[PDB]
């Protein structure tokens with residue numbers, strides 16, 4: 001999928017996690033987020049279209065999604081363990097990674 | 107290892123999982139598949155032999171193995187947490203990821 | 213952070229794990245190691261500075277940190293279930309992955 005569609009999937013499911021009441025909604029949303037994060041790694045964002053494909057900026061872009069995926073992993077295991085509020089608090093901390101990438105590359 | 111040997115590792119251990127009897131075989135097989143998936147990221151497939159290692163097809167290729175590794179991760183936790191049958195089911199669903207990369211780059 | 217600081221974070225936290233008393237200390241140190249491994253993957257090491265950013269060496273360097281991160285994952289899960297000695301032994305085996313990269317790119 002396009003980068004913006006993957007971003008839509010990340011944002012829509014973050015909202016689902018924040019509003020969620022049970023572990024099933026959270027786990028389902030985090031699984032969708034992981035898939036969108038990895039697929040976004042394949043994209044070149046418009047602001048880096050003037051960069052080499054292995055420039056430090058594109059490596060930084062791609063590793064940002066590895067960092068997001070590992071944060072999603074921690075939240076997803078908490079959701080699996082039934083720790084709904086902890087899984088939601090971990091999903092809130094995802095936003096630092098969202099924001100940091102946007103600051104550099106949106 | 108080179109790409110073909112990692113692919114044999116993937117194929118052989120997928121068969122071990124399909125024909126497994128105990129959790130130890132499945133856990134051991136999935137850990138070997140993850141290792142092989144990550145090692146395969148270092149390779150250049152013959153159909154991309156001449157392209158540049160940072161071309162979008164090479165990025166798509168390498169991210170295919172992150173996706174495979176994360177799907178292996180879910181199956182390995184199913185094996186580690188008991189559910190041998192559901193791990194084998196998840197291992198079987200990996201073939202969709204195997205096949206999607208093969209359609210493009212094999 | 214730069215590569216050398218991330219390397220000292222890896223080494224310091226491996227020391228912390230070796231002298232830890234309880235699982236919380238081991239888990240917290242492994243998460244710091246995971247953060248540093250991913251941040252170091254963004255770096256260009258001195259030995260490859262005069263190579264193409266898209267060189268096969270640079271890809272091999274970055275995949276090494278994926279392999280480290282996934283080994284840290286298994287150690288971290290041992291710590292989460294409270295298996296202190298088992299987590300410490302797995303942390304100790306990380307040194308094989310540390311050294312394998314150093315042999316090539318130190």
Ligand code: HEC
Nearest residue numbers: 004007010011045061064065068094097098101102105106
């Ligand atoms: C880089 C490593 C990023 C991470 C991590 C996240 N996002 Fe992102 N996002 C990124 C870029 C480069 C862009 C620009 C897109 C464009 O082509 O215009 C975006 C965009 C968004 C958007 C707006 C999409 C649109 O409608 O145009 C949203 C809503 C968004 N991103 C959300 C989002 C969330 C919720 C994230 C973490 C959970 C997140 N992004 C991470 C790059 C990166």
Ligand code: HEC
Nearest residue numbers: 110113116117120151167170171174200203204207211212
């Ligand atoms: C891309 C991201 C791939 C994923 C995921 C999987 N495979 Fe693959 N495989 C890929 C390529 C480019 C090739 C061709 C290699 C070559 O040198 O021709 C292959 C090949 C195989 C083979 C045949 C190996 C041979 O000796 O010719 C097998 C048996 C194989 N692959 C199995 C396999 C399995 C079981 C996978 C998922 C669990 C899988 N592959 C994923 C690229 C990619």
Ligand code: HEC
Nearest residue numbers: 215216219222223257273276277280306309310313317318
């Ligand atoms: C490649 C994939 C590596 C892995 C995995 C690990 N290290 Fe490393 N290390 C690497 C390089 C290229 C370098 C040289 C960096 C430089 O700028 O000089 C290093 C260096 C170190 C150091 C010294 C850092 C310094 O102060 O200059 C330490 C203490 C170190 N590495 C430790 C370490 C540990 C404990 C690792 C595994 C847990 C590990 N490294 C992995 C490349 C790679």
Ligand SMILES: [Cl-]
Nearest residue numbers: 054160165271
């Ligand atoms: Cl790359």
Ligand SMILES: [Cl-]
Nearest residue numbers: 062168169274
């Ligand atoms: Cl990568």
Ligand SMILES: [Co+2]
Nearest residue numbers: 073077285289
């Ligand atoms: Co896990």
Ligand SMILES: [Mg+2]
Nearest residue numbers: 001002003005
């Ligand atoms: Mg489009």
Ligand SMILES: [Mg+2]
Nearest residue numbers: 002004005008
């Ligand atoms: Mg759209």
Ligand SMILES: [Mg+2]
Nearest residue numbers: 001002004005
């Ligand atoms: Mg679209």
Ligand SMILES: [Mg+2]
Nearest residue numbers: 220221223224
């Ligand atoms: Mg000092």
Ligand SMILES: [Mg+2]
Nearest residue numbers: 220223224227
């Ligand atoms: Mg010291």
Ligand SMILES: [Mg+2]
Nearest residue numbers: 220221223224
């Ligand atoms: Mg010191």
